[PDB]
Design a protein around this ligand. Structure first.
Ligand code: CA
Lengths: 48, 160, 80, 80
DNA sequence: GATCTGGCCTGTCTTACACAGTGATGCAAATCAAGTGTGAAGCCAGACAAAAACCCG
DNA sequence: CGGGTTTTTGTTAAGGGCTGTATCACTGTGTAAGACAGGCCAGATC
DNA sequence: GATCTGGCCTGTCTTACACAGTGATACAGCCCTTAACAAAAACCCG
DNA sequence: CGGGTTTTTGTCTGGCTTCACACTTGATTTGCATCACTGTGTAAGACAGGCCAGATC
């Protein structure tokens, strides 16, 4: 849905550089790191 | 983050959080393009380096003015790097599944993996405030997704 | 869902007796449909078809409260 | 902040941060209108009620239709 | 006597520039590997005698 | 293979304080519907 | 013979409407005390 | 207003822990300064309508 779009614009607005060259590399890095199982397991470590 | 870290260090005295050095170190550990691996076929038309991550998606598209002009910025990984990194951080999950479904850790493969793929455009991604509506700049991510890892041993297989 | 809403508009059309039909007749039939549905189910009828309203139309209460409009000698159990 | 608090509380076992209601009390101790005080002259045309916080900036204007129109939004503190 | 025109007057877009952010580099400084080896503090078992303060005859 | 004795928790009160999410009144905001504006023909018509 | 026309495609162009996010608000559950029975187990005798 | 009754407050004598330097000197990591680079909103800054009195057939 709009799910990726709001996430992508938020990643462009919060944590990103200028000159449009490092920008897409940074958003690819952060968007990759958001969806790894390892940190996801660290982040839902409250209910167990 | 650095402000928060230095304030908690100043208040607590002992250090609990971390500065950015070890953060970026563990980041490039977790990033693709870091761990070694191999292929039993030689993989024609594929490079042999195990240590390349982010590259241009253009794959050497010469965008000189004498040729067909584009402006679309494209960043990409290498595919096998993404596969091996996804495997290495689902390694604990598949270890626990192997310990759960009545097996040992010293098993060999060949583990059969089912991978779907997807890409979709997202419409506008732009916040133009200099004069208002400049361009409906449309962007698109292309992605993969693992959904099933199995191993066949003896007679049958098992969804590990 | 679009076909079900259409066949309800054509059954309030009762168009197995009216073979020809103008756009005014179908518009008035949709008008009577939204009037009776806002009187019975008291929902917000809209032509912007979504999934929630489509799921909202799929029950026996809806098929009852719409089928009771026409003099169905047969169409009741057919819709059922 | 709630996410960060619950994640570090889970991963250390100790509760190093604070939850949200304690944060609300810690901010209510720092807003205007909490401590008592008085004035040796009784401060004419000032309501001496001593627990007022964010009040409406318009001081009770006359936003009805039959009055001069004003569509601004003003929020203020009392000065004392 | 009645239009034409340079001169001011003033509410307009119009337009640059300095900084605020973003990450990532790059050294200089502090701190830590282990290595003995004393060796100065700190606390307790044994039983034995002073400072400081509030109440009652 | 089964009891005797020993080594550990549940059970409902009651009336609190504490905490962890669920909800609540809200806007804002993009992407599908589907409505419509033309664009281009096969046949009526001068 | 040439020209308008109804109809059929079709590429925009607006819009409702489903969610997203937020501080504040509202409960839904969780320790605490007698207490006298209710259970689970572990080991050992038998 | 002196003495009673607590309350601390020490005491050697021997007998335990327990880090502190002491360098050593070479990795490691830590802190802060620097770097590359656009976004934006602003206060100068012309600027042209507009309204004058001066000029003129
Ligand atoms: Ca889409």
């Amino acid at each position: 849905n709009q799910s990726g779009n709001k996430l992508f614009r938020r990643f462009r607005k919060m944590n990103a550089r200028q000159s449009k060259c490092y920008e897409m590399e940074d958003v690819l890095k952060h968007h990759w790191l958001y969806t790894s199982k390892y940190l996801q397991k660290f982040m839902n470590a409250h209910n167990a | 983050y650095h402000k928060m870290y230095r304030t908690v260090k100043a208040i607590t005295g002992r250090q609990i959080f971390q500065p950015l050095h070890a953060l970026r170190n563990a980041e490039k550990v977790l990033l693709p393009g870091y761990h070694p691996f191999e292929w039993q076929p030689p993989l024609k038309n594929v490079s042999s380096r195990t240590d390349v991550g982010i590259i241009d998606g253009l794959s050497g598209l010469a965008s000189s003015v004498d040729e067909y002009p584009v402006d679309t910025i494209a960043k990409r990984f290498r595919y096998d790097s993404a596969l091996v990194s996804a495997l290495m951080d689902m390694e604990e999950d598949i270890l626990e599944g192997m310990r759960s479904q009545d097996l040992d850790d010293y098993l060999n493969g060949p583990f059969t993996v089912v991978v779907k793929e997807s890409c979709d455009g997202m419409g506008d991604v732009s916040e133009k405030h200099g004069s208002g509506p400049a361009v409906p700049e449309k962007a698109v991510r292309f992605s993969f997704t693992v959904m099933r890892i199995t191993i066949e041993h003896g007679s049958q297989n098992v969804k590990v | 869902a679009a076909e079900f809403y259409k066949i309800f508009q054509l059954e309030i059309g009762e168009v197995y007796k009216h073979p020809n039909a103008s756009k005014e007749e179908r518009k008035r039939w949709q008008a009577t449909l939204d009037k009776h549905l806002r009187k019975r189910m008291n929902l917000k009828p809209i032509m912007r078809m979504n999934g929630n309203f489509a799921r909202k139309l799929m029950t026996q209460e809806t098929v009852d409260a719409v089928c009771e409009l026409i003099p169905s000698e047969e169409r009741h159990e057919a819709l059922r």
